[PDB]
Write a protein that binds this ligand. Structure first.
Ligand SMILES: COc1cc2cc(c1Cl)NC(=O)C[C@H](O)/C(C)=C/[C@H](C)[C@@H](O[C@](N)(O)OP(=O)(O)OC[C@H]1O[C@@H](n3cnc4c(N)ncnc43)[C@H](O)[C@@H]1O)CC(=O)[C@H](OC)/C=C/C=C(\C)C2
Ligand SMILES: COc1cc2cc(c1Cl)NC(=O)C[C@H](O)/C(C)=C/[C@H](C)[C@@H](O)CC(=O)[C@H](OC)/C=C/C=C(\C)C2
Ligand SMILES: NC(=O)OP(=O)(O)OC[C@H]1O[C@@H](n2cnc3c(N)ncnc32)[C@H](O)[C@@H]1O
Ligand SMILES: [Fe+3]
Ligand SMILES: [Fe+3]
Lengths: 674, 677
C-alpha cells in the first residue's frame, strides 16, 4: 500500500492558473508518501521552487517523494487531496468568472494533466480521492501521536465549511464531536490582526514573537468587543459590514494606525500583539476546557495551522486540562496533505497506521552521497576553501565554543517550518549578544525576534520547566519557561517573558545533532545551542547542496558544516565562474512612464519575480544588457564581456541580486541524481 | 451660496492610492457645482482623463466646473463628499493594511492636498461636509423632479450601511422610512451575475440589453433558490460561505459554465440573462407594491445605479402603482456627488432647491467658441475636409435621409451615461440593417446590442406607448413598448420584444436636437432618429473638440457635424503631422521572460495603460524605439525619421494604437482656454 498525499493549487512553474493568483489560494504545497502506514517521504514544494509558502502544484515534491521511496508513478495505489472536490472546483470556478480568458479546467483535470505531463503518469479517476479538509488535518496530527485514544482539535483558517473541528479518535477511527463555522475562524482573526502590524500572510509567528514584549492590558477591552465567550464551549466573533477584516475598523475608530513597512515597532504595536495573543489563548482554552471534561479524554492532539502558535501550545501544556499533548511538525496545510493520504487509504481498503510516535521531521531529499558532494564542492572551488576533519561533529563543537556561528546541513531536510538539526544555523546560546548579531547581521531581521534553543534530552529538565502535561518537544511545538536560575546563563535563547520555544534532541530523534549538543556541553558546561533556520530573508529553508552553499556565501556565517565537510568563503571569491540561470518566475523589464509635458519618461530597468507578493529590484543599464544574454550555460564572466568585462561594480550589483534570489548563480552543471 | 459636490477616490493622474487599485473602489468620479440651488455645472472625470468610470480624484472636473461658473476656487462655500468620513477612511485603512508601504493619508487630508496642489485652494476644514450615501442619491433624484412631495427609492450596490433606502420627501425635507442591509444588494446580485457572462463591472447594461433575447423560464427555478419574497416588503438573498459571489456556486453545481472572452453567447447565456433580469424586477416590484400602499404616495423618484436599468424602470412605469415617476440622468454615484452638494448646503445653513424639473443633462464643458473651433479645425487640415454650411441642421437632416451615419457634437456635454444630442452618433432609425452597420463597423461591439430612438415631443405618442404613468423621457431612463403597427417602420431601434429605450426631445430640453429630428421627419415621414453615444469601444463619451475629431477619424462614420461645421476624412490623411503625447497612465515596456534551459526569453515590446483593467498591446521593435523618443512636442513624422521614416507599416501600427487610445495623437497645440459665451 503506497499512497500519495497532495495539497496546493495547480499552477505550473512559470505561470499561475489565473494571472497574479493571490498568495493565499491553496498555499504550502507539498507531497507526502505513506507506505504500509508509515510516512516515508515528505517535502513542501517551497523548498524546491524557492518560493516561500508557494501555491504552485507540488510537481517537484511528488517526483522527489517517489525517488526517496524508490517507487515509480505506476506503483502508487491512491492519491489524496486535502479538500472536497466541489469546494476546490467552486473556488476555481469563481477565479474563472473574474478571468474570462482562463480555460475552464477544474481540479480533477488539472491534477491529471500535471501528473501526466510532469511525471508520465496517467492517474486513473478511481484512484484519486478528495477528502474533508479537517479530516485530513486530524489524521495527520493523530496517527503520528503514538496514542490509541485521544481528543483531536483542528483549528486553522478554514476548511470547506468549518474553521474548527473537534474529533474523538480511537484506534484508526475518527468521530466528529463538534465544529465551528467559518466566520468564527481564529486563524482568520490572527491573520486579520497581523495585517495591522505591517505584516502579511506567513508572518504570524513574528507577531507571536512580538507579543511577549507588550502589555495585554492596553487593548484587552478593545479586543473584548470582538469576541464573546458563551456557555458550553461556544464563542462568537463579531464582524462588520465595512471591510473584510475583523479587527481594523474598531481599532481605526480608537486611533490605532496600522504600522508601515520600515517603521519601528512602537509600544502600541507591542501591546496590540500582546492583546491579540491573549485573546486567542482565551478562546482556545475556553474550547479546550469544555471538550476536555465533556469527552473525557486525558490526551490531546492539536493540529491545523493555529497549532503552530507555540505560545498557545505552551499554555495548553501548562494548564491542567490534559495529561499528554501532541503536535505534528507540519500542522499547517502540508500536514493536511499528508492526512489526505491516510484518509484515501481508509476509503479504499483498511487504514494502516504508524507504529510509533513521530520523532524526526527529517523526511525530504538529502544532500547527496559522500562522493557527489565532494565532487560538487570542487565545482565551487573558486569561491570556497574546504577541509575534511577526522570528526566534523567534534570540530564543529569546538568552533561553536570559540564563538563561531555555523551553518549545519546534514541528511534529509525538515518537513514543516522548523529547522531541527538538518538545515540549521547554530551558535552558542549563552551570550545575549548572539541574539543581537544573528538577528541583525545573519538572518537580517527584526531585533525583537527570539531564538529557539536546542537542548539534549538528558539535560532538558536542568534548564527548562517541562512540568504539566507531557508534550512532545522534538519539533519545537511548545514554548516553555526557562528555569529562573538559568535565564542569565542562556542569554541568547531566553525571551523577555523568560520562555523559550525549546527543542529536546535525543539520540533517537536526531543522533548526530544530539552528539553535537552533548559534546558542546562537555566543552562548555552548557548542553544548549541556539538553533535558527538555515535561510536568509529572501528564501525558504535551504534544500540542495547548491542551496546550502549559495545561502552560506550570501549570508554572513562564519563556517559551513555540510556532510562532514568544513566550508569557508575564499578571501577573494571569483563570481565570474558562476553560471547565471533565470528562475521560471524571473522577469526583466525596461519601462518608460509618462514624463513632464506628456513626454516619454526616462528608462528604468527592473528584475522581478512573477508571482503574487514577489519582490523586485532596479538594475543598471549595463546589467540589464548582461542578464538579457543569459543562456543557462555561459558563465557570468564570459557574459560580462559583451558589456566590457565584469567590473567590480557589476559583480557587486549581481551579488546583491543573488542575495535576493532574483536568479540562480551556481557553478556549471549540477550534483546529479542523489 | 456656491457648493461643490465630490465623489470617487483620491488617486492622482499617474498613480493610484494603492497600486493597481481595484476599479470598484469609489468609481465614476465626478465634480458638481450648485449655486443658489441650481445645478450650474457637472462633469464626470471619465470624460476628461478618458478612463471609463475612473476612480481617480476628479480634479479636472472641479476645474471645469469652477470655470463654467466663473468662480475662483476660494469662492466655494462648502464641499460635499458622497460618503461618511468613518466609512471611506475605514476602507482606506483596509487598503493600507494590505499595502504596508502606502502612506497613511485619509480622505480629509487627501481632498485638501489634491485641491492645494491642483488648484492652489487651501480648503478650510469647516467647509468639508461628509454625507450619508443614500442621502446624497435621494437629494439628486428628488430635488430635480419638479415634485413637491414624493416617495424616494434609492437602490444601488452599497452605501456606508445599506443597499437600498426608502424615503418620504416633502419640500426640502427627507424622512427615512426603511432600509435594506448590504448583503441584500440587488446591485451586487446583478454584478455577481454579470461575471458569469464573461463581462464585468460597468457591463450591466449590456446584460440588460441581452435579456430580451432569452427565455426567463429556463433558470427561473434556479434563481428562486437565491431569494425569497417576504411580508411587509422584505426580501432575503441566500448567501454561501464558498466564494464572494451570490450566484456562481449554485449555478456551477447545476452545470452552468461561465462565458469566456470571445465566445459567442449561447442560448443558455441568453436565458440566464433573461432569468437574472426577471428576478431583479420581481424583487424591486415587491418592494414598491408595499411602499406605494403603505406610504400611500402617487409620485416616485428612483435613484441609485440600479435605476439605470431602463427595463426595470419601464416595468415600474407600466405598473399602476404610481401616477408620476422621475429618474435623474446620472442616477449612479456621479449623482450622489451632486446630491452630496445639496446635503452639505442643508447641513451648513439652508437648502436651496431647483426651480423646475430637470430637462437637459447638457451640463459639461463645451466644445469652444466659434472662432477657436474654426482655428483648431484648421490645425487638423492635413487629415480632414471642412465645409461651413448655412443651416447645418438642414444639411444634416438630408444626409440622414440619404443614409449617412453622423457624428453630432454641440454645446455642453451630457452628465450621465446617455448621449442625448450633444455628443451623439445619429442615423435613420427605419432600416434594420443600420443596426449591424453601426454596431459592427462603427461602435465595434456585439451585434445583439439594440439602439435607442430619439422622437419628438409632438410625434412621441404616435410611435411609443408612453402610458401607465407620466414618466420623464428626456434622458432615456424608461424602456417603453413600440406601437405594434410601427415596429416594422422602426427597424433599427426596436428590440426583439418590441420595446425601446426612448428619448423624447422637446424644444425645451434640446432645441437644436429637436429641430434636427423634426426636420428629418418632415423629409421622411418618420420623426425618429437612432441615437447612440459618440465613442468607440475604447473610450467614454467624447469631450473636447480634439476628442470628437480623434473619434471620428478612428471610427467609420460618414460625416461629423460639430458646431455647424461639416467634417469629412481626407482621401489619404497625413498622420505624420500629429504630435504624440503620453497619457498619464501610458507605460511603454520591453519585457523578457524565463526561457527554456533556464535562459532569458524573447524581448517582447508592449504598450499598456496602468490602471486596473486597462488595455495592453504588443508593439514592433521599430515602434518601441519611436514611442520611446516621444517628447510631447515633436510630430510623429519627425520622430519617425529616427527609424527610417513613417513607412505605411508604421502608420498603420500607430493608427491601431491610436484607435485603442494608448496615447494622445493630436495636432500641435490645443484649442486654448474655452472662451466665454
Ligand atoms: C476572493 O475570493 C475569496 C476570498 C476569500 C475567501 C474565499 C474566496 Cl473564493 N473562499 C474560500 O473558500 C477560500 C478557500 O477555501 C481557501 C483559499 C482556503 C485555504 C486553503 C486556507 O488555508 C488553511 N486551511 O487555513 O491552512 P492552515 O495551513 O492550516 O492555517 C493557516 C491559518 O492558521 C493561521 N496561523 C498560522 N500560524 C499561526 C500562528 N503562529 N498563530 C496563530 N495563527 C496562525 C494562519 O493565520 C491561517 O489563518 C487559506 C486561509 O485560511 C486564508 O488565510 C490564510 C483566509 C483566506 C480568505 C480569503 C482570502 C477571503
Ligand atoms: C477588498 O476590500 C473590499 C472588498 C469588497 C468590499 C469592501 C472592501 Cl473594503 N467594503 C466596502 O465598503 C466597499 C466600499 O463601500 C465600496 C468600494 C463602495 C463602492 C462605492 C460600491 O459601488 C461598492 C459596490 O457596490 C461594488 O459594486 C460596484 C461591490 C463591491 C464589493 C467589493 C468591492 C468587495
Ligand atoms: N456605490 C454604488 O454602488 O454606486 P452606483 O449608484 O453607481 O451603483 C453601482 C451598482 O449598480 C448596479 N447597476 C448598475 N447598472 C445596473 C443595471 N443596468 N441593472 C442593475 N444593476 C445595475 C452595479 O452592478 C453596481 O452594483
Ligand atoms: Fe488548514
Ligand atoms: Fe451608489
Amino acid at each position: 500500500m503506497l499512497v500519495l498525499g497532495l495539497n496546493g493549487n495547480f499552477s505550473a512553474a512559470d505561470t499561475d492558473v489565473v494571472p497574479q493568483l493571490g498568495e493565499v489560494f491553496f498555499h504550502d504545497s507539498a507531497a507526502s508518501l505513506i507506505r504500509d502506514g508509515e510516512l516515508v517521504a515528505a517535502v513542501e514544494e517551497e523548498r524546491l521552487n524557492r518560493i516561500k509558502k508557494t501555491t504552485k502544484f507540488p510537481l517537484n515534491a511528488v517526483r522527489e517523494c517517489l525517488a526517496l521511496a524508490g517507487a515509480r508513478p505506476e506503483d502508487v495505489d491512491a492519491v489524496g487531496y486535502y479538500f472536497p472536490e466541489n469546494h476546490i472546483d467552486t473556488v476555481l470556478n469563481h477565479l474563472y468568472t473574474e478571468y474570462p480568458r482562463a480555460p475552464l479546467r477544474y481540479s480533477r483535470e488539472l491534477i491529471r494533466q500535471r501528473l501526466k505531463e510532469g511525471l508520465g503518469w496517467d492517474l486513473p479517476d478511481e484512484k484519486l480521492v478528495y477528502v474533508p479538509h479537517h479530516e485530513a488535518h486530524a489524521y495527520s496530527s493523530y496517527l503520528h501521536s503514538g496514542m490509541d485514544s485521544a481528543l483531536v482539535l483542528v483549528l486553522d483558517g478554514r476548511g470547506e465549511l468549518h474553521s474548527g473541528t473537534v474529533y474523538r479518535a480511537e484506534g484508526t477511527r475518527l468521530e466528529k464531536l463538534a465544529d465551528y463555522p467559518v466566520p468564527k475562524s481564529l486563524g482568520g482573526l490572527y491573520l486579520n490582526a497581523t495585517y495591522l502590524l505591517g505584516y502579511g500572510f506567513g508572518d504570524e509567528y513574528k507577531v507571536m514573537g512580538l507579543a511577549p514584549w507588550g502589555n495585554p492590558e492596553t487593548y484587552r477591552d478593545t479586543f473584548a468587543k470582538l469576541y464573546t465567550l458563551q456557555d458550553n464551549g461556544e464563542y462568537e466573533l463579531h464582524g462588520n459590514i465595512m471591510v473584510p477584516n475583523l479587527v481594523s475598523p474598531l481599532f481605526y475608530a480608537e486611533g490605532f494606525r496600522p504600522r508601515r513597512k520600515g517603521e519601528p515597532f512602537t509600544q502600541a504595536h507591542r501591546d496590540f500583539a500582546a492583546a491579540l495573543q491573549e485573546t486567542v489563548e482565551k478562546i482556545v482554552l475556553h474550547i479546550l476546557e469544555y471538550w476536555a471534561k465533556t469527552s473525557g479524554h486525558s490526551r490531546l492532539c492539536f493540529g491545523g495551522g493555529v497549532a503552530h502558535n507555540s505560545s498557545l501550545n505552551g499554555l495548553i501544556l501548562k494548564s491542567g486540562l490534559f495529561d499528554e499533548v501532541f503536535v505534528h511538525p507540519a500542522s499547517h496545510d502540508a500536514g493536511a496533505g499528508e492526512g489526505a493520504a491516510y484518509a484515501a487509504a481508509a476509503s479504499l481498503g483498511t487504514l494502516e497506521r504508524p507504529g510509533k510516535r513521530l520523532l524526526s521531521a527529517s523526511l525530504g531529499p538529502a544532500l547527496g552521497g559522500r562522493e557527489q558532494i565532494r565532487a560538487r564542492l570542487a565545482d565551487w572551488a573558486p569561491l570556497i576553501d574546504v577541509e575534511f576533519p577526522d570528526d566534523a561533529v567534534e570540530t564543529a563543537a569546538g568552533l561553536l565554543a570559540e564563538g563561531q556561528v555555523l551553518g549545519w546541513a546534514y541528511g534529509r531536510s525538515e518537513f514543516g517550518p522548523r529547522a531541527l538539526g538538518h538545515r540549521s544555523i547554530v551558535a552558542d546560546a549563552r551570550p545575549e549578544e548572539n541574539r543581537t548579531r544573528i538577528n541583525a547581521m545573519v538572518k537580517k531581521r527584526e531585533g525583537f525576534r527570539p531564538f529557539a534553543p536546542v537542548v539534549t534530552a538528558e539535560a532538558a529538565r536542568d534548564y527548562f520547566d517541562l512540568s504539566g502535561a507531557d508534550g512532545n518537544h522534538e519539533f519545537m511545538s511548545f514554548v516553555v519557561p526557562v528555569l529562573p536560575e538559568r535565564r542569565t546563563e542562556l542569554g541568547a535563547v531566553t525571551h523577555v517573558d523568560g520562555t523559550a520555544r525549546v527543542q529536546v534532541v535525543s539520540a533517537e530523534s536526531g543522533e548526530r545533532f544530539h552528539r553535537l549538543v552533548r559534546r558542546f556541553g562537555e566543552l562548555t558546561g552548557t548542553p544548549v545551542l541556539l538553533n535558527t533556520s538555515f535561510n536568509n530573508n529572501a528564501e525558504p529553508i535551504v534544500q540542495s547542496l547548491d542551496d546550502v552553499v549559495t545561502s552560506f556565501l550570501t549570508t554572513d556565517l562564519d563556517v559551513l558544516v555540510v556532510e562532514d565537510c568544513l566550508v569557508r568563503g575564499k578571501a577573494s571569491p571569483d563570481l565570474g565562474v558562476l553560471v547565471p540561470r533565470f528562475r521560471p518566475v524571473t522577469r526583466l523589464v525596461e519601462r518608460r512612464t509618462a514624463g513632464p509635458d506628456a513626454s516619454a519618461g526616462a528608462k528604468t530597468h527592473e528584475i522581478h519575480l512573477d508571482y503574487d507578493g514577489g519582490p523586485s529590484a532596479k538594475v543598471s543599464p549595463e546589467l540589464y544588457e548582461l542578464l538579457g544574454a543569459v543562456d543557462g550555460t555561459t558563465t557570468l564572466g564570459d557574459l560580462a564581456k559583451t558589456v566590457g568585462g565584469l567590473s567590480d561594480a557589476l559583480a557587486t550589483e549581481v551579488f546583491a541580486l543573488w542575495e535576493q534570489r532574483f536568479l540562480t548563480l551556481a557553478p556549471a552543471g549540477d550534483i546529479g541524481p542523489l
